[PDB]
RNA sequence: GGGGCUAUAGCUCAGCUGGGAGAGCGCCUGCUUUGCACGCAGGAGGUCUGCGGUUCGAUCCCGCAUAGCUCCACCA
RNA sequence: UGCCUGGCGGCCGUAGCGCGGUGGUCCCACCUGACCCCAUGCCGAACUCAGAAGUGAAACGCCGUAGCGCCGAUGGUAGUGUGGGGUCUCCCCAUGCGAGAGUAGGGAACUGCCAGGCAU
RNA sequence: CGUCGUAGUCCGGAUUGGAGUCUGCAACUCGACUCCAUGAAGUCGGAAUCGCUAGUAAUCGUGGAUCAGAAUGCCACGGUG
RNA sequence: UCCUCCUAAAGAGUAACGGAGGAGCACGAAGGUUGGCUAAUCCUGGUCGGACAUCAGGAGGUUAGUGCAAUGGCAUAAGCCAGCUUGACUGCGAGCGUGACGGCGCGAGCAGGUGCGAAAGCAGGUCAUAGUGAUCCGGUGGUUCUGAAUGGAAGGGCCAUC
RNA sequence: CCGACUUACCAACCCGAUGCAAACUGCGAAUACCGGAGAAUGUUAUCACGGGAGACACACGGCGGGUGCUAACGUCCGUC
């Protein structure tokens, strides 16, 4: 690359709260604490849950029953 | 440099398996991730176009190219010659960095998330997408930015058909549908 | 009326045809566009005309390609 | 039109100068080349000057 | 790629045609080099040489870098010297004058050809 | 009535109308109407027989016109010199040589196609005959 | 045949070296009025005659057509 | 010398496209890496420099393929130079030159020089 | 007493979804009220116009009639003033 | 008046109150050179994004571009990008084209001096054709060329130039 | 909202067949024109120079065409 036109790009150190810490290179300057991961984010198990439908017959068949 | 070594070790062999290419240089690669930021008000006013140089320099460590119209159209009254947007060629071990940070930071940020969507493949192979705000990257101090903005990603891969690149991503574990 | 104005015109077209022994920086073919290309010493001039840089016959070839229709002067 | 006919004068001690036109009305600022000036044969400096 | 590099190199070859000289014609892979000095007969080479050539080959590690080019640039101005062709026109071919090809020049001029 | 929607040139020489024509074979339909002589039709002239042989059949089958006009005729005005350019351009003819087919028709007798080209070839200023398909 | 014109429901600038449609009146809705005019206050407004061309883009450039206005259509 | 490949040509579509198959010892391409010589209105993509693990996928080359493109007779027709005739906006006769489109058909190029590999 | 720091805010509470309690044969058209969430417009108001001379104006609560449930109204009472 | 096409009859020319168009300029870079690059449109996908900005890839191969009217050209690009720059130089010119003539145009090469390139080479303005004005009379700047007795000067000449 | 579905609709690129063009050419003659060799012929018929002019209102016929009405003993050109 052309030595000068770049901005810095080196190596930081990305901690979260799912255990994972990952030393990536960035642009930060410093360090790094994330909100989620790739390890913990709910798609691998959320979306079973995260449009939440249930059932309008079962919800009447709760709310009484004869 | 993760991802590039993966990709050498684990993904070769079983795209190569599993789609049963005769040599082993039929596998798919990735050559150039891009990245562009098309303003509309670059010619309403200048200063938008440093501020989005200052977004494409955090987003990626290069200093991102201003480019410029090709034709001189009327509905978005642009003259032939005025710069419009600015956009960034990554390719190789910048490109593999920045895809790690993105498919292990970014997309985990993606407001609503429902996963990426699957038509967006333009017969081919080579993968796009949009990002609404920028702010999702890691880099963007949440803080400091006064102006929302966003982009879109292209990653061309050089597959034969879309099929193998939906593979190819699916086996570098995309979060798809 | 509205077309009664025409040019004056510039009397273009090939002076000295094929076998014809030209002298020295005579004047082959005056025109417009590169009709008829260089060869074997012919100068193109300013406004393509064709000038013959050395003594002898002209001889038009058509060689190239695109069938582009090339003037040689032999000797 | 909007053109300018404007004398390009030399440096080199002569009374010697081209003539050349400058657009005296979107370009202002002072033209100077390096022209041949026959007097002293050799390519000296030549600055804009008024006609 | 290559007509890329035709498209590159037939200014230089037409007008050279034109011209009338002798050229040095080079052309650069990037695990060989070769050169060969062609009259403007335009189809009858005179000299030739190439560093797949065992006898320019047999001196160094690598037969496609700056030093074999260096090596075979001096067998070719050697082997027209000796033919007696003094003023070539080097004709780079498309690639830079840059590198591999710089170090041919240099060793055909250091050695005698006068172009 | 039948003219070009839009041209290069508003007015075109007169030029002469020699040679033999092309169109000579019956290509679309079964039975058509060549010109045997040598003149220019009109727009109006081939609208009046195209509607007179649709009155003759009686609109049952398909009705074919070949050529078409695109040349346009200019004439000066009355009591206007003959200096001061070419007259404005009035109507529109189309050129006939000797072989060409004008209109073919199918869907139809052959008698019924005899009896309609002659009522549309008495109201066309060239001399006309009758022809068939061949193959 | 030559000029000059066509822009809110009617009358008029703005076309002016090509990128904002500008007023008085007519109109709507409030307010004052015993009510209606008058006045006050706030407003949506228009194919820039039309149709194709002409550059990115036409109130602007061009051609053709419509419609009204004036000048000319004399010498025997 | 038998073939294959690289280079510079001759030639300009019978030489170009398409479909299918094929070649990596050598050569070529892809490839590995690049603070570096050198480069990018950003990017080792290109350009360039170090090299040789793999591959012949792409690219390139070779081979079959009438799906195109391309070439194309013999005859005829249009036209026209010269002389003559008529019903003279157009033709006709004696004569000389003879197209274009189309038809039978042709058709998956050929060739020179050098260098390298294979037993030759 | 704490907090809030002049912001569309810890202002405003509309509107909308879910969950409900009561009354009532019956709350979809069409009741009231609660909880959770959502948090529109609005940043003191042009032309004009209205009420009030003292416990009045202004501001804050409470009750009654009607009434199964249904008042930001009506009729009353006090509080600061 | 000047330029382009047709008229115009396959060299040049060729008319009319015949048929269509434009100019009376622009440029210190839009010229020179070196090095590099290849378009119109359509399809697919994509954040604000709308038939139309930017980005990827494709199909297509000049259907684009030339500072400008049309024609002839253009891929070696005459088209588009960057570096370095003033050859948008001075005196000349074989040999031609073109016109009645005044004129107008093309020009390899030579002498001096310079630009780009490593070097061969290119450069005496722009892709070419339009972009304009004869003489007289003055003005400006150089030049011992004459200087109406002699020494100067005025004036006049020549060269550049309004 | 999603317009699901259509009526015997229109309509762009495409493909197949058909015509036309002074300002169209992926093709292209005859004659003409220019240059070289050759034989015959022609009272040098060609060229340059110098003395002298005249003429620059043309007409019709054949062919090619432009105004016009494929009108004119019309007008304007090319060649004879
Ligand atoms: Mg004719
Ligand atoms: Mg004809
Ligand atoms: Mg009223
Ligand atoms: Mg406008
Ligand atoms: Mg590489
Ligand atoms: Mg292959
Ligand atoms: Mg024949
Ligand atoms: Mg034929
Ligand atoms: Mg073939
Ligand atoms: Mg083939
Ligand atoms: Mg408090
Ligand atoms: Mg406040
Ligand atoms: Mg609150
Ligand atoms: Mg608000
Ligand atoms: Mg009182
Ligand atoms: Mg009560
Ligand atoms: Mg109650
Ligand atoms: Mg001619
Ligand atoms: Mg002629
Ligand atoms: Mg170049
Ligand atoms: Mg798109
Ligand atoms: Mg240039
Ligand atoms: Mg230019
Ligand atoms: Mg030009
Ligand atoms: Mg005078
Ligand atoms: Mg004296
Ligand atoms: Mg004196
Ligand atoms: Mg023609
Ligand atoms: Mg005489
Ligand atoms: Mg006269
Ligand atoms: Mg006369
Ligand atoms: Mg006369
Ligand atoms: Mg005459
Ligand atoms: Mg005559
Ligand atoms: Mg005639
Ligand atoms: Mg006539
Ligand atoms: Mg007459
Ligand atoms: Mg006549
Ligand atoms: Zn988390």
Same mark, same amino acid.
């Given at each position: 690359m052309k030595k000068d036109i770049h901005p810095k790009y080196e190596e930081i150190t990305a901690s979260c709260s799912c255990g994972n810490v990952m030393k990536i290179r960035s642009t930060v300057g410093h360090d790094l604490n994330l909100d989620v991961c790739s390890k913990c984010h709910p798609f691998f198990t959320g979306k079973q849950r995260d449009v939440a439908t249930g059932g309008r017959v079962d919800r009447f068949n709760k709310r009484f029953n004869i | 440099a993760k991802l590039h070594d993966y990709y050498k070790d684990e993904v070769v062999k079983k795209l190569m398996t599993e789609f049963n290419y005769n040599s082993v240089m039929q596998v798919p690669r990735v050559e150039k991730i891009t990245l562009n930021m098309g303003v509309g008000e670059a010619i309403a006013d200048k200063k938008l176009l440093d501020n989005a140089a200052a977004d494409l320099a955090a987003i990626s460590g290069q200093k991102p190219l201003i480019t410029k119209a090709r034709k001189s159209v009327a509905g978005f009254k642009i003259r032939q010659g005025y710069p419009i947007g600015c956009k960034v060629?990554? /390719?190789?071990? /910048?490109?593999?960095?920045?895809?790690?940070?993105? #498919?292990?930071?970014?997309?985990?940020? #993606? /407001?609503?998330?429902r996963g990426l969507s699957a038509k967006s493949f333009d017969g081919r192979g080579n993968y796009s997408m949009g990002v609404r705000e920028q702010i999702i990257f890691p880099e963007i101090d949440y803080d400091k930015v006064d102006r929302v903005r966003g982009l879109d990603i292209t990653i061309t891969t050089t597959?034969?058909?879309?099929?193998?690149?939906?593979?190819?991503?699916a086996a570098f574990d995309f979060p798809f549908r | 009326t509205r077309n009664g104005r025409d040019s004056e015109a510039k009397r273009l077209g090939v002076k000295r045809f094929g076998g014809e022994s030209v002298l020295a920086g005579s004047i082959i073919v005056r025109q417009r566009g590169t009709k008829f290309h260089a060869g074997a010493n012919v100068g193109c001039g300013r406004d393509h005309t064709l000038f013959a840089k050395a003594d002898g016959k002209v001889k038009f070839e058509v060689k190239g390609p695109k069938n582009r229709k090339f003037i040689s002067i032999e000797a | 039109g909007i053109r300018e006919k404007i004398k390009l004068v030399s440096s080199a001690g002569t009374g010697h100068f081209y003539t050349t036109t400058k657009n005296k009305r979107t370009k202002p600022e002072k033209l100077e080349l390096k022209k041949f000036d026959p007097v002293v044969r050799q390519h000296v400096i030549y600055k804009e000057a008024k006609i | 790629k290559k007509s890329a590099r035709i498209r590159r190199a037939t200014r230089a070859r037409r007008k050279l045609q034109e011209l009338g000289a002798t050229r040095l014609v080079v052309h650069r892979t990037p695990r060989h080099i070769y050169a060969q000095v062609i009259a403007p007969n335009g189809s009858e080479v005179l000299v030739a040489a190439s560093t797949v050539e065992k006898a320019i080959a047999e001196q160094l590690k690598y037969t496609g870098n700056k030093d074999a080019a260096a090596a075979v640039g001096k067998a070719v101005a050697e082997r027209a010297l000796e033919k007696g062709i003094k003023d070539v026109s080097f004709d780079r071919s498309?690639?830079?004058?840059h590198g591999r090809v710089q170090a041919l020049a240099?060793?055909?001029r250091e050695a005698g050809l006068q172009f | 009535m039948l003219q070009p929607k839009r041209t290069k040139f508003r007015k075109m020489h007169k030029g002469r109308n020699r040679g033999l024509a092309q169109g000579t074979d019956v290509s679309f339909g079964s039975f058509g109407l060549k010109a045997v002589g040598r003149g220019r039709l009109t727009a109006r002239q081939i609208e009046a027989a195209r509607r007179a042989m649709?009155?003759?059949?009686? !609109?049952?089958?398909?009705?074919?016109? !070949?050529?078409?006009?695109?040349?346009?005729?200019?004439?000066?005005?009355?009591?206007? !010199?003959?200096?001061?350019?070419?007259?404005?351009?009035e109507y529109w003819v189309a050129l006939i040589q000797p072989g060409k087919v004008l209109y073919e028709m199918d869907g139809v007798p052959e008698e019924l196609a005899r009896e309609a080209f002659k009522l549309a070839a008495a109201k066309l200023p060239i001399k006309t005959t009758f022809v068939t398909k061949t193959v």
């Open positions: - | 060629t990554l /390719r190789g071990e /910048r490109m593999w960095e920045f895809f790690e940070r993105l #498919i292990t930071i970014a997309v985990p940020r #993606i /407001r609503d998330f597959a034969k058909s879309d099929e193998e690149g939906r593979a190819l991503l | - | - | 498309g690639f830079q004058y240099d060793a055909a | 649709t009155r003759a059949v009686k !609109r049952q089958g398909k009705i074919w016109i !070949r050529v078409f006009p695109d040349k346009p005729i200019t004439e000066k005005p009355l009591a206007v !010199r003959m200096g001061k350019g070419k007259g404005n351009v």
